[PDB]
Assembly symmetry: C3
Homo-oligomer: 443 residues x 3
């Protein structure tokens, strides 16, 4: 039992059209995941007692997605062919006037594709030193196309709506147990009265913008940066498509930021390169579950989308109404014993460090702990028995040694969170790909 009640009152409710019903009313807080109000009720005018438990099972924010695109890993492949001045297409203005969608006759053997591709021409040296009788600039013709490095894609998306669901477990007067789902300003009729989410203060808060990646059949990941609305070089989605299949085939309908392919002309040699963000590196770094500002992001039931779970404290008021019954008393909290187990993770990182505790109690409650200056907060569930419970904290030193005071009933006792965390070196998701061209013999 948890101490959850904030207020208790009697209310008369009349049906205007004219019957009147008298109800006892209790304003309780959800408190935290696992918290449970134990209520014994007394009849208002009659001498009867009833029993009722209301338990906070979970607090979830469902991500309703907005804009979405597919991306992946890409790499360039080059065809090259240099002609002397006055040979082939290498006359006067042609090379310098070349268009990205004009294919040189040097590459006629190439059939038409539906692939992301471009064409270039670079003036090179002339004269004997470059195998030409003519001294004017020779023409290095280049045809390039993109290919998927691996035959799998990633779907990147933003979250526009975070829809709250507060799941409650209610043990009614008859002892029957039901699950009640409540949204914002929602009220549910029960056989003993009603229960309503009368004030909801749950929501995504903080100073960071973020988005998510779906890896088909391999889960989700968080991107700790704002969603990129258009293709931009140096950003995730600098190459993007409208389908999973178009990423795999590097289809021409994909969008890409300007100038993503580099060229290094070397007379008869030529390197075509890219320096793209590796989205799979991004995915592995932010692989769910991830916790940010006490919100745990993970895949929903059936891997349909992402959700933010509260695993500890919950900020929601619940108004209970009991027909013809009012509060006699509430169940008292019981103490719990907590022992530090381990601390694992990194410091100065978004993911943070995982602290695990062993919790022993004789009833369902909530462990609440804090460091001295109150900069750190631990909130974990307790029950009749002994379970390990973990959560994420964020530190900024390698050698952590911080004392906490904890309790489930208000009688605080010391607990030392001690461990070694690792550093994460500054990183760069860009990876060079590509290389020398395939040299075509002159025709």
């Amino acid at each position: 039992c948890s101490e959850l009640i904030q207020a208790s009152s009697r209310i008369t409710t009349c049906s205007t059209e004219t019957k009147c019903r008298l109800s006892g009313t209790a304003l309780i807080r959800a408190g935290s995941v696992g918290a449970e109000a134990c209520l014994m009720l007394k009849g208002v005018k009659e001498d009867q007692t009833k029993f009722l438990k209301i338990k906070t099972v979970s607090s979830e924010l469902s991500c309703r997605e907005g804009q979405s695109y597919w991306t992946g890993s890409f790499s360039p492949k080059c065809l090259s062919s240099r002609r002397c001045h006055l040979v082939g297409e290498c006359h006067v203005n042609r090379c310098l006037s070349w268009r990205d969608n004009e294919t040189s006759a040097e590459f006629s053997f190439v059939g038409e594709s539906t692939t992301m591709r471009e064409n270039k021409c670079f003036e090179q040296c002339g004269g004997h030193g470059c195998g030409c009788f003519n001294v004017n600039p020779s023409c290095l013709f280049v045809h390039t196309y993109l290919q998927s490095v691996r035959k799998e894609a990633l779907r990147v998306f933003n979250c526009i709506d975070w829809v709250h669901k507060l799941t409650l477990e209610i043990t009614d007067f008859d002892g029957s147990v039901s699950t009640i789902d409540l949204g914002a300003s929602s009220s549910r009729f029960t056989n003993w009265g009603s229960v309503s989410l009368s004030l909801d203060a749950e929501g995504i808060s903080g100073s960071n913008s973020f988005s998510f990646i779906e890896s088909p059949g391999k889960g989700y990941a968080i991107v700790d940066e704002p969603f990129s609305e258009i293709p931009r070089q140096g950003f995730l989605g600098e190459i993007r498509c409208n389908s999973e299949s178009s990423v795999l085939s590097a289809h021409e309908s994909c969008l890409r930021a300007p100038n993503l392919i580099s060229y290094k002309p070397m007379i008869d040699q030529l390197e075509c390169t890219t320096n793209l963000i590796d989205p799979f590196v991004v995915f592995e770094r932010g692989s769910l579950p991830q916790t940010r500002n006490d919100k745990t992001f993970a895949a929903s039931k059936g891997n349909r989308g992402v959700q933010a779970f509260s695993k500890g404290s919950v900020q929601a008021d619940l108004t209970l109404m009991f027909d013809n019954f009012e509060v006699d008393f509430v169940g008292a909290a019981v103490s719990c014993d907590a022992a530090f187990l381990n601390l694992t993770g990194c410091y100065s990182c978004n993911a943070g460090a995982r602290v695990c505790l062993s919790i022993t109690s004789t009833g369902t409650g909530t462990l609440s702990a804090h460091n001295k200056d109150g900069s750190l907060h631990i909130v974990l569930p307790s029950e009749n028995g002994t379970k390990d419970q973990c959560q994420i904290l964020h530190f900024t030193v390698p050698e952590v040694e911080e004392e906490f005071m904890y309790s489930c009933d208000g009688d605080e006792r010391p607990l030392l969170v001690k461990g070694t965390l690792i550093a994460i070196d500054p990183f760069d998701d860009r990876r060079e790909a590509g290389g020398e061209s395939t040299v075509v013999n002159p025709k």
Copy 2:
């Protein structure tokens, strides 16, 4: 009537010693249109007094921060190629050319206060390129920018979101007044006081955003963080401090580096830009736009933007009644709800609009949820039949989703079904510019 009451108590208050006994009711705002019906009993006397409190709207006002003007810019250039050892084309000059130096090739060009730059690109020499001298020739270029359209756009961020909760209060005699309350504010009435005692209204979510004003044509949202300095490939890569400066493409405007591209072709030359079209950005996000159940729209008078909570509202009101306490409260009445239509897109920021036919016998709130609770609908119910709409976000083209609804708490099914359109991946970059005017 709505069941909004959370707590009821009898509180005595003492000044300094005069003491006043007031009935005290803690009610939830609930949602827009929700109305608390309170019959009071004389604490001292033997009178019954009726009182109604209705939530009319809940607005967050955007107090703006940094702001700039921008537009749709385009390049126009002059070019002139000279042979080596001719004119300025000597030794080091072309490779050493500075952006702010106008070539003597364009000595006929007057003074300017427009954004401009200058380049010199070496080109082929020798007989094949019309020069006796075999050394590299010099293609000089003078480029300035201009505004395509004769209109500009002001981009800005929002630093403060200031809450206003507007209440409609019905006195004992049936007199109706309107009260506005901000955070932690109270207001005296002729029957006591109403105060916003706990406010959980605010802008929450996983996205940062900004806004654009189009003078006399309304506002738009920008579903991306405000760009603090000029950056290539972002809105405001070119920006000015005024509207008039955008139209003249004045030299005081800022530019990110290297926004103008050059393609020298011996005697031909193209100067091009590939800039974000802010007008396209504007049209995509033109208000009203709804994000995380916040409806963003122009404030009345068309003076800045506001966020309206058109459905659910999270705020506690504390009511005090002088010498009166709560006798009873009006019961909620049930309503009938039927699906009307569903219009919009899927996997898009704007979302889709759902409309319901709602019939009831009194003022109240309709609440709905799909099976897994990932979708939520909150809409006002009234006596009679009225249409009500709200924005939802989906990720499939064919929607078929059963909702359970109630106004009184007794749930009934309802089917939201319709077809949503796709929005293809887009790029706001638009190519502009072209060939130069060739001198001589």
Copy 3:
């Protein structure tokens, strides 16, 4: 006294485990935090005995502590280079050698430079040939370039984001003694006192708004806010386009530092060469956002370390009070205050905003609340017995501000005119050009 009472009743609490049956009867009071300086004055009466005692509860501060995530060091860097042009067929200037040059290949032209652990790169640019460029052969000459970076100033800056914002509500509680104690509450927390317990039963405090931001630490010189999202990797045109894992690595421009592609521009001029950078000046960024800074009524300041967000006006939290064997008898009434507009200093259309100051005359401790006509501007400031000045940040969009406020501490509002002149802040570019002409090496 403040009017903070929201509910009041008796609650009986009992052990239900079957061991020790101890039922305690408590009075219970649900109060709003209201704002900084808000103080509930509670006269309690005995529940089992004929006794009275006075109790006060005052909201002292509401702090959100930044638990940092990813972090990096940066600074202002500058390019320095050596250049040496060789004619075609001379030295390394053969076939396609110049066009094939790799960033990490030092030219033989610069064999004299010692071992280096500094950020550096090498280039080769083809230049003119023939007798006009001092060469016998007409194929392109080779301008070889070796470039290294250096830090201008001997300072560095640490840029970081905030992942967690841990709330702490501090209260001053005056017992029946007159004795005052300070208590700290986190979310859904309870603290026992000698008269019962106080618990933060509903917490509506948090970082809200439409902007993402991060922070900069200047070692021994405070912090700053950056009104833009943290950049996770080096990107040209952004803070952190060059970043390091330590302060000293910034100062030495160490090779372990990361940088975005092509941050060094080159201007080949036959035997002259300019190597330049146009990097974001992080010290300019720091100065613009120097703490304290107020955003959406949140005052960001140093912890005194790390950064915190203070709610100095309104505070949105409910507190649940339990009194052992005591219940609420009555509460102290709020008092009127009179406000006088002092001054208004700052800028318009800017993230920093403008600071308004009032002089608030009252007869007791409370809270002043005000609003302009359309309710787009809100003012919440602490009130005290006497005449005292108080200030807060507002945000405007005009150089000449004219706003009429209706203020109150009890509920009956009176007019108040706010009038001032705010400066404009022109659009800015944090980029600064650096570097210049190469040191020209003589051939060997």
